[PDB]
Symmetry: D4
Subunit: 180 residues, 8 copies
């Protein structure tokens, strides 16, 4: 193709982040060359997931997002068959060894309330914790339990607003927002 | 030879883990090419030992497993001739500088109670702590003192069930279980 | 799945070779988890292509195989729009800056004559050079022009027979041969 | 040119520190080849800023100094548009995610009181924290809040006096002091 | 700013190539953020210069392009004060230790004849060799002496047409061509 | 020369440790080729000093031992001219930013009481803390303040007894002990 | 044990050379801790083999020595089943793709004539080339064909005499010579 | 001390070159802190020696300069006891495996004829080849045999004039010239 959004994603995100999002999109029958707005969303969600696991202790989180579908489900089985928690119907993003629960991370262009309502409606397993982030600096989590400390969460929303600024600087933000 | 279990071990475990287990098996007159089930057990026990030492402080544990027999006994002498603890009759796996005791790590395909009974019957030195892990997610330790925190131990049993799943996925688990 | 052939490919070939073949198979709607015999063939063909380019001078060959379909065709256009050679109907493997021609590399489980007859029948552009290799140590090329020197070609067929031996050692060769 | 101060800066400071100060000076129309005293000051201020961020937690500080003017202001916007703090009129050096305030770092050849009076007079945003260091081992901060612990701050002033000694050892200190 | 050409240059060229062109443009009072077409030209000329020196022997060429103005002229003085050749009025790109002459490399969007006529009219030192390349695959040199072998020069023009294709793929070529 | 002790030191200690001890011995007019027993002592003292600084926080200790005489005294001046402590008459080994005092580390083949009595008699500055270690597992410090935690100190004496065992294993210990 | 020869081997030879010789000795039921003279011989023979392959072209030699017995024989089969040469009764050291023959390398403490007579008497396959080196600087090869150029062979014998000097410097040469 | 020449040497020459010259000067009872002009000469001579060996084939030269006195003489013995050449009375710089002779490299601030006359008068072994270089771009060798090709020698004299320019740029050349 040859879009400005594609070259911005390869320049804005880490090379391994781009490669992991490309594998995830291709595994689900999607083309980052054409679905460039979704390409920027998968990369952003991947970085937020990895920054989220970077907060806390060394053995606190088990990263589920970023693996291929078969191996990601294999880790979920080992976590469920060990701690005893229920098997989630959908693939979560992380697991908290400190709180004994799975975490579903969400990044939002609209309001954090709307996505969470849709994310909580999909996830029938009420035990799975949910944590939403927005490109404007807002956040919301299940039972007001934000898991990480304030500084690690603040670094996540700061990076989110930087991506939003770099997008609007080259005029890709308007098409990116009205696309979720 | 040319077994499926051998190629799985080289693919499932870290290269240095495979090399250390090969040296340990050859030092005791064993061939990983033929004793492929024991090859997978030594690798699993080595990774659990190294993950165990990864939990805690930086100078907490002194790793005994993984060294050759002569040097491993040399470290044991230095630890005994310094802290004043008794010399164990058999080579332990680690030493706890925080609890002032040696640790014997065990990985189990049957029940954790049976191995511990055999491990405690062999080790005459009652001061040496014993910690058993199973491929189903169970654990048991001397005086209910599990040494590490809950998160580090949970990561160990999660990896153990992942190895069990990958084994049964290629149909090596049945021969691996009925072989201990 | 969980096949012996898959674990052998990850153990026999270089990690980047495995990753490049996985991307090529997925790009064309193929699964290395199920098409394990084709997985071993794409890896073997990729290594032969890279060993082929390793022979000769530093700027002699332009590697076409291993790139994604869009970029690989982009290089072909630049080579054709510069030297003046005809655009091949199908994607070749390399280009010879010394002989001013594209090269189509083939690896064969049957006879080198049969594949070349099929490879020459497909490639309508008669200018594209063709070079076939077999797992038994045979080779054949267009106009008896084998491009590289004898030592580099001998190293290719030696590696091919080593892959054949390691396959039959674990009893994957019979299914691999009767599958082309 | 060919000054002794220039060769001392390249020998005393880290290569990346020298490169970052050269880019900052050139971006503001300054030549490190001629403004060698200012070259040593920008390098010293850069190292102090980086040593300052090295103290504390992992996600405590967001480094603003060292970036180009456009990107540095982009981070400031993301920090302000997220936490809700006021936009500073001038570019600060760091941001404290623990104390929710920007930090202006200063290095001084005269008295710490004089610079702070000038630094506080320039910065109209009273919320921005100010922390001054001197080449004699003195320090002063807003509301006597020195942010970091005593050991990290002591390491900063120790390095400052080492730079002062190495300068006077080669007789560049007198020209460096009477130049601020 | 936020241009598509800028993000393409950072994605198309090597990171060090981008950094060297940014330093060269800033040293001569130019902004790669605004002069994005000239930014792509300096990067292309830098890569061609480095690919040119990559052809031949190990000690054949002395790279002049890529250094800052003062050091680049220092090398020219050492080359002139040693071999005895005349000092060029303008900074050349390379020096040939095999042919005992400086080389001026040119990359062209129009015809190779027009630039060479302007390049030869500027360079009064007739001893300095001139070698022009075009984005269409053409080349021309002084006295028909193309210095390098055919394969190394062909690799240069092939890369030039690839840059032209990637530019027109994202629709930056038309503005890039009508800008020289 | 060609001594067994020399080859043991290069094999027992880290390469950089050997290089730092060689520079220290040569700076004071000593030859590690002939003073092989002193060569093993300087290496042992250097490793203990570096293991000592490895215990505690990140910015707790400033390493003085291992630097050349001029730079080591330069750091001492910066530490004294900043914290305000007295200048020691002799070069110490470390400085404690947490306890605000210099540390003199000693390694002993005889009794820890004898060296400390000689070390305390030499060091007139009573503020400088003193910490002695022995090859048998004993330790003693000023005012019974052992600075580090128990685990870090235990790791030091364990390494000391390992060096003693490896020395007696090759029969260099007897000459090493009766040489202090 | 604790021998001077052992510590000299670990200090004189490359770490990977020592590890490869240890694996080869253990595979054949030998202990480098006790067979220290044979330990120095296997290391010397391994380095000579690797220096030998370093001479010539890039794809000239296929290294057989250094591999485990099963894989080394696998390469020999691939070389024989491709070029058509006869299978040697004993494991050779290298294969010459330029001369189409296997090479048996020998290192000698006595006279080069005596070993070659024993090496040629053992190797029944007269096609396998034989090349002997001595610690005094002598060499002899089959049909006076020394394969490599003079400079590469001279570097081999120079290293051999350096090992002999370092051995006699520490007084291990006399026991090493009267041990072959 | 604190001289401009010292900081220039650490900035002009490669770090390992500086370390090797410091060891050589200290081994012969010289201080680079005070003998700064000799410090720049040993570094220059070391780089010329290493650039000289960089010219030619891979196994052509054996580097003698840069080693400590004992090991350097050990290599000379191995070279003499192998090729059969005479033992030089003084330590040479290199040995030519292609020409079978030792090489004495010289760098000169005066005329190349004067040094060679002194270098040839000292070296009684007439077989040792002599090659002189000057800071003005001149060279002279025994029997007009300049060993290397023209391009490698030209790169040496070009670097020599660059060092001369950087010295006079900071005004250290006049003291450096009138000091040989
Ligand atoms: C484990 C490995 C990759 C991990 C992904 C994650 C990346 C991590 C890298 C760190 C270092 N930082 C931080 C600074 C820059 C950098 O690089 N971070 C965190 C922030 C952004 C980033 O990049 N982590 C965590 C453990 C080590 C590691 O690398 N992943 C990928 C999905 C599953 C997983 O665990 N794996 C696992 C197998 C395949 C693979 O690649
Ligand atoms: C010390 C060294 C090897 C250590 C073994 C152990 C390995 C450690 C590596 C870490 C990093 N991680 C973690 C992520 C992947 C990785 O790589 N972990 C822990 C988890 C799995 C693993 O691999 N550790 C601990 C100290 C540093 C080190 O490497 N061993 C081997 C036995 C004795 C010993 O102390 N030694 C010692 C001499 C020989 C040698 O090799
Ligand atoms: C250029 C780069 C990758 C190259 C592939 C190829 C791999 C090469 C690596 C060499 C080193 N050796 C040899 C010993 C082991 C090793 O590692 N060999 C050759 C033998 C096997 C192997 O692995 N080469 C050649 C140039 C440098 C390089 O790496 N490819 C991939 C397809 C296109 C291409 O040019 N590229 C290009 C962009 C993406 C990428 O990755
Ligand atoms: C992030 C990266 C560079 C960082 C600058 C800073 C440098 C850091 C390096 C550490 C490791 N240590 C410590 C020992 C020596 C060393 O090397 N320290 C701190 C002390 C001196 C030093 O050097 N940090 C912090 C995060 C990792 C890193 O490297 N910077 C530069 C300005 C903005 C920023 O965050 N970035 C960001 C994009 C461009 C770039 O280069
Ligand atoms: C010397 C050094 C940089 C050199 C520039 C040049 C880059 C070279 C790198 C090679 C490796 N390849 C090839 C494959 C990818 C890669 O990376 N190539 C050539 C092709 C593209 C490229 O990148 N070369 C040549 C010598 C080693 C080196 O790196 N330059 C910069 C201007 C002056 C100079 O000599 N210098 C010198 C001082 C500052 C600095 O950085
Ligand atoms: C700073 C640097 C060297 C330091 C010496 C010291 C070495 C440190 C290395 C660490 C990593 N570990 C631990 C595992 C193996 C290893 O490697 N440890 C500690 C244990 C043994 C060891 O080796 N440290 C501490 C800071 C980083 C570093 O490397 N020194 C030398 C004297 C002064 C000093 O601060 N410097 C400073 C300038 C010259 C130089 O080289
Ligand atoms: C291929 C690899 C190891 C090779 C052994 C050999 C070592 C080579 C290393 C080179 C680089 N130099 C030279 C300077 C120092 C150094 O390091 N040299 C030659 C001189 C001494 C030395 O060390 N070579 C040659 C190819 C690349 C490589 O490393 N071997 C081991 C036996 C079989 C084999 O091919 N393999 C193969 C699989 C296991 C393994 O490890
Ligand atoms: C062998 C090793 C060091 C060698 C010195 C020499 C340095 C060589 C490094 C090359 C790479 N280049 C070139 C580009 C920059 C660089 O780095 N060049 C040549 C030009 C300048 C330079 O630096 N060489 C040659 C072989 C590999 C190596 O490194 N020396 C030191 C004296 C004896 C010797 O052989 N040794 C030997 C034992 C101790 C040690 O360190
Ligand atoms: C669209 O198919 C896929 C599937 C995967 C694997 C698992 N995916 C997730 O787990 C996940 N996906 C999204 C997301 C992103 C873009 C558009 C729509 C959604 C719902 N957002 C999340 O927060 C999240 O956790 C990866 C990528 N694309
Ligand atoms: C099956 O679709 C693909 C397509 C590609 C991209 C381009 N492919 C080739 O260029 C190529 N493909 C084969 C091959 C391998 C397995 C089965 C059948 C064939 C014909 N053999 C070659 O020699 C060769 O050059 C890569 C992988 N799979
Ligand atoms: C002179 O223009 C510049 C501008 C920048 C970008 C932002 N600069 C700062 O933020 C900053 N500048 C100084 C400083 C240093 C030398 C002379 C005068 C001053 C006031 N001191 C600080 O403490 C500080 O934070 C970088 C370098 N030079
Ligand atoms: C515009 O000022 C500069 C100056 C330098 C330093 C030296 N420059 C060259 O040597 C050089 N410059 C060009 C070029 C590029 C863009 C627009 C116009 C020209 C004439 N083309 C060349 O071929 C070439 O060798 C680097 C970058 N920009
Ligand atoms: C003998 O001259 C030197 C001098 C230095 C520089 C500073 N030295 C120390 O600081 C230091 N020296 C010893 C030590 C070691 C061997 C024999 C006698 C002594 C007293 N022991 C320590 O504990 C210690 O701190 C380094 C090496 N050798
Ligand atoms: C003693 O068993 C072994 C066997 C191997 C595997 C293959 N070995 C060789 O190929 C080989 N062995 C020697 C050698 C060395 C010491 C003592 C006696 C001999 C004959 N010399 C060679 O030249 C040579 O090629 C490796 C090591 N030890
Ligand atoms: C002054 O003592 C030393 C000794 C060595 C070891 C061997 N030295 C040489 O081989 C050598 N020395 C010089 C040189 C340099 C400065 C002043 C006088 C001379 C004659 N010039 C050479 O060309 C050369 O080969 C290294 C350094 N300094
Ligand atoms: Mn997800
Ligand atoms: Mn999610
Ligand atoms: Mn054990
Ligand atoms: Mn155990
Ligand atoms: Mn192909
Ligand atoms: Mn093909
Ligand atoms: Mn600032
Ligand atoms: Mn500041
Ligand atoms: Mn130019
Ligand atoms: Mn040019
Ligand atoms: Mn000391
Ligand atoms: Mn001490
Ligand atoms: Mn052999
Ligand atoms: Mn042999
Ligand atoms: Mn010399
Ligand atoms: Mn010389």
């Amino acid at each position: 193709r040859g879009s400005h959004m594609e070259d911005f994603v390869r320049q804005c995100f880490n090379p391994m982040i781009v490669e992991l999002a490309e594998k995830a999109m291709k595994e689900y029958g999607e083309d980052p060359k054409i679905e460039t707005n979704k390409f920027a969303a998968t990369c952003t969600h991947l970085e937020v997931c990895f920054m989220y696991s970077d907060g806390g202790s060394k053995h606190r989180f088990e990263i589920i997002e970023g693996r291929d579908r078969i191996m990601a489900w294999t880790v979920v089985n080992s976590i469920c068959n060990t701690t005893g928690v229920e098997k989630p119907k959908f693939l979560p993003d992380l697991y908290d060894y400190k709180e004994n629960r799975f975490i579903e991370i969400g990044v939002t262009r609209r309001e954090v309330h709307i996505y969470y309502l849709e994310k909580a409606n999909k996830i029938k397993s009420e035990k799975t914790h949910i944590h939403i982030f927005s490109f404007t600096g807002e956040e919301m989590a299940t039972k007001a339990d934000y898991t990480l400390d304030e500084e690690s969460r603040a670094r996540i929303k700061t990076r989110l607003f930087t991506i939003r600024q770099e997008m609007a600087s080259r005029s890709l933000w308007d098409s990116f927002r009205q696309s979720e």
